[PDB]
From a paper:
PSMD2 serves as a docking site for a number of substrate remodeling factors on the 19S regulatory particle and interacts with the ring of ATPases that unfold substrates for entry into the proteolytic chamber of the 20S core particle. Here, we use mRNA display to rapidly identify peptidic macrocycles that bind PSMD2, an essential component of the 26S proteasome. Determining the structure of PSMD2 at high resolution either alone or within the 26S proteasome has proven challenging due to the relatively small size of this subunit, the preferential orientation of the PSMD2 particles in ice and its intrinsic flexibility within the 26S proteasome. Here, we describe a new strategy of targeted protein degradation through direct substrate recruitment to the 26S proteasome.
To overcome these limitations, we reconstituted PSMD2 in the presence of MC1 and two fragment antigen-binding (Fab) ‘chaperones’ to determine a structure of the PSMD2–MC1–Fab complex with a resolution of ≈2.5 Å. Analysis of the binding pocket showed that MC1 uses the HRYxGW motif to associate with PSMD2, consistent with our mutagenesis results. Specifically, MC1H7 establishes polar contacts with the PSMD2E336 side chain and the backbone carbonyls of PSMD2P871 and PSMD2L873. The neighboring MC1R8 residue establishes a charge interaction with PSMD2E878 and hydrogen bonds with PSMD2H868. Residues Y9 and W10 hydrogen bond with the backbone carbonyl of PSMD2K773 and PSMD2N737, respectively. Finally, W12 establishes π-stacking interactions with PSMD2H770. Together these contacts span the wide and fairly shallow binding pocket with a buried surface area of 720.3 Å2, with the majority of interactions mediated by residues at opposite ends of the macrocycle’s long axis (~20 Å apart). A 2.5-Å-resolution cryo-electron microscopy (cryo-EM) structure of a PSMD2–macrocycle complex revealed that the ligand bound to a site of PSMD2 that is accessible in the assembled 26S proteasome and distinct from interfaces used by other PSMD2 binding partners, such as USP14.
Numbering used by the authors:
A (entry chain A): 260 to 349, 367 to 613, 649 to 849, 865 to 903
B (entry chain E): 29 to 34, 50 to 54, 92 to 98
C (entry chain F): 33 to 38, 53 to 62, 102 to 108
D (entry chain Z): 2 to 16
E (entry chain C): 1 to 3, 27 to 34, 90 to 99
F (entry chain D): 34 to 38, 52 to 62, 101 to 110
The structure:
């Protein structure tokens, strides 16, 4: 009798019929509470009949309602509640940089010195889209605080300035990510603007709804959104954003209506319009819809046969490598060894097992040194994907070397990749490198912008957050984290026009992957119960709550308590002798 | 309206506030 | 300057509350 | 922030 | 970059094609 | 398909003889 083991295996299989059949027929309540914590961490919400023994509490756990309070409690143990302004870490371009830095560092602590009681003083120092992303950063600071988040955002939903209102809509979506609040306040607030006359409003509302509902393929939210790709007033940017939102909401579900609607939107577009790089967001949403489903993808590869030849290579490659993202398939990697999405797909497939990942690391170094001049632009982003929140020294040395490339896009992507690799770690080596590289790229606005983003990303959450997609002994992959990471890195395969252009708000897709990296233990009543742990790697002695790093294993120091789950990661319930 | 409140049915026009 | 009266939002000066809820 | 130790939190400087 | 630093057994150094020889 | 040493790499249309094209072994 070890239902948390069976449940972990079922989650590995992604076979929700068996997950639901194992969660039921467990008679022990506290075991179900532990399994509910596991499901909440994995982003699976299962509907229960109100006549199950403890429906109220199992539902309350599964929806991460208490996540914010435990996170702030650990923030009180560390004495880190004080806000940091961006200059502590150290034109429109630099105010935009400061806004993103401020949001990244103060993420999940609802405090700030820029977005004060009155945020207009900061918002109106920005212009156009930078003001949209500034307004969106407020919702990133208030992450997982739905009630307080909306209470703070609400004043800006009535702004006369459309960019500020669009950013407030996106923020309102962001604060609802991961917290599955049983009120659907985001759907009520955002759903009137998905067909608004202003396209900027449509972008804010649709990206917000996509982030708020990324976990589950809600039929109502999908029925609301799917019409917007066919609207004659929708820009290609709006069609792309709609495909991203629908694929995030429907991630891994094989939803047929998303598939058919996207294929129709491809088949309608001119061979002249499919050159627009927002069109790359159309098949990304398609791949997200079939992420990890493997050999089933052939049925759709045949339907793409009619599409124009230049676009066809990209769509086919991206959708195919999405279908195999977790496989760690030796033969697809041989096939991949258009080119950018190929190398990104190599990383996306290889990250599932370590030997393939080391061979990928060798390949990526070879490509950065001697590869095709066009092909190497994507090579550092693949290094990000395979090693997010994992500050290896060899990877950082390689990226630091190529952060001076005379090709501007190799430089941009290497700096962003350093920020991704070091994200959520206060790594002093990386911080010093970034400071020196900031002194080198002074008088270079785009490289300096990438430097500020990487600096902010290193201090994400003041060191308390991670972006790694894996959890629970590095054996379960969060699909919503993968969807957010892929959204960002595929948008970085055209950094000069998407990220350095108008659409840098897509950086907020990283919020889908943000998770806490703290171990916390409870008694059987969910009351903070301090115990002592021996955190090694597989060592010092620590008292829970303890922050774990990327590859560390905690084991209870004494035999007084016994854990209900064999893995001491995240939230663990502890029984008595 | 799929975007309204009646509080919140178990505990108004959000956009217009009418 | 943290609430709206019944419509006026004196912060945004929007014209046409239980914080952000409709009630 | 400083750099706590008991709880395995690594800070940075300002600190 | 300029090159000092490190070359992975690429020894003249020929670390990459995009660096000065 | 080779390269000749400023340097020119025709097979890569890049402008900035190596024994090996893949790794440039001297």
């Amino acid at each position: 009798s070890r239902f948390p083991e069976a449940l972990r295996l079922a989650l590995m299989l992604n076979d929700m019929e068996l997950v639901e059949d194992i969660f039921t027929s467990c008679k022990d309540v506290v075991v179900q509470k532990q399994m509910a914590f596991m499901l909440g961490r994995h982003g699976v919400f299962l509907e229960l009949s109100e006549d199950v023994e403890e429906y109220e509490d199992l539902t309350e756990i599964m929806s991460n309602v208490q996540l914010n309070s435990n996170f702030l409690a650990l923030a009180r143990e560390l004495d880190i509640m004080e806000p940091k302004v961006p200059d502590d870490i150290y034109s429109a371009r630099m105010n935009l940089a400061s806004s993103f830095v401020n949001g990244f560092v103060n993420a999940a602590f609802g405090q700030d010195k820029l977005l004060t009681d009155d945020g207009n003083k900061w918002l109106y120092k920005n212009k156009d889209h930078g003001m949209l992303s500034a307004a969106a950063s407020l919702g990133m600071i208030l992450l997982w605080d739905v009630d307080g988040g909306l209470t703070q955002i609400d004043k800006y939903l009535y702004s006369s300035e459309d960019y500020i209102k669009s950013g407030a809509l996106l923020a309102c979506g962001i604060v609802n990510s991961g917290v599955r609040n049983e009120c659907d306040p985001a759907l009520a607030l955002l759903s009137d603007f998905v067909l608004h006359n202003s396209n900027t409003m449509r972008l804010g509302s649709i990206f917000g709804l996509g982030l708020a509902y990324a976990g589950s393929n809600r039929e109502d939210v999908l029925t609301l959104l799917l019409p917007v790709m066919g609207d004659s007033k929708s820009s290609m940017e709006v069609a792309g954003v709609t495909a991203l939102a629908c694929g995030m909401i429907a991630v891994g579900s094989c939803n047929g209506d998303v598939t058919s609607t996207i294929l129709q939107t491809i088949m309608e577009k001119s061979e002249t319009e499919l050159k627009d790089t927002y069109a790359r967001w159309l098949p990304l949403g398609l791949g997200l819809n079939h992420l990890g489903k493997g050999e089933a993808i052939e049925a759709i590869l045949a339907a793409l046969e009619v599409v124009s030849e230049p676009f066809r290579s990209f769509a086919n490659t991206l959708v195919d490598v999405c279908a195999y993202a977790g496989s760690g398939n030796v033969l697809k990697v041989q096939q991949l060894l258009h080119q950018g999405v190929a190398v990104l797909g190599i990383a996306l497939i290889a990250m599932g097992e370590e030997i393939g990942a080391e061979m990928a690391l060798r390949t990526f170094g070879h490509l950065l040194r001697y590869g095709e001049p066009t092909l190497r632009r994507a090579v550092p982003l693949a290094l990000a994907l395979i090693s997010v929140s994992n500050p290896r020294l060899n990877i950082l040395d390689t990226l630091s070397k190529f952060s001076h490339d005379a090709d501007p896009e190799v430089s941009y992507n290497s700096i962003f990749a350093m920020g991704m690799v070091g994200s959520g770690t206060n790594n002093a080596r990386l911080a010093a490198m970034l400071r020196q590289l900031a002194q080198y790229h002074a008088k270079d606005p785009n490289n300096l912008f990438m430097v500020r983003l990487a600096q902010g990303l290193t201090h994400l959450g003041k060191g308390t957050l991670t972006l790694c997609p894996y959890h629970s002994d590095r054996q379960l992959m969060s699909q919503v984290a993968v969807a957010g990471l892929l959204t960002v890195l595929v948008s970085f395969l055209d950094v000069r026009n998407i990220i350095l252009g108008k659409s840098h708000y897509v950086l907020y897709g990283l919020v889908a992957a943000m998770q806490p990296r703290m171990l916390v233990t409870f008694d059987e009543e969910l009351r903070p119960l301090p115990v002592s742990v021996r955190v090694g790697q597989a060592f010092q002695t620590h008292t829970t709550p303890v922050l774990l790093a990327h590859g560390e294993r905690a084991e209870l120091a004494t035999e007084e308590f016994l854990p209900v789950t064999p893995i001491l990661e995240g939230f663990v319930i502890l029984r008595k002798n | 309206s799929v975007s309204s409140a009646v509080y919140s049915a178990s505990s108004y026009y959000y956009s217009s506030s009418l | 300057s943290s609430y709206s009266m019944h419509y006026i939002y004196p912060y945004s000066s929007y014209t046409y509350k239980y914080q952000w809820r409709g009630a | 922030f400083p750099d706590v130790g008991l709880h395995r939190y690594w800070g940075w400087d300002c600190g």
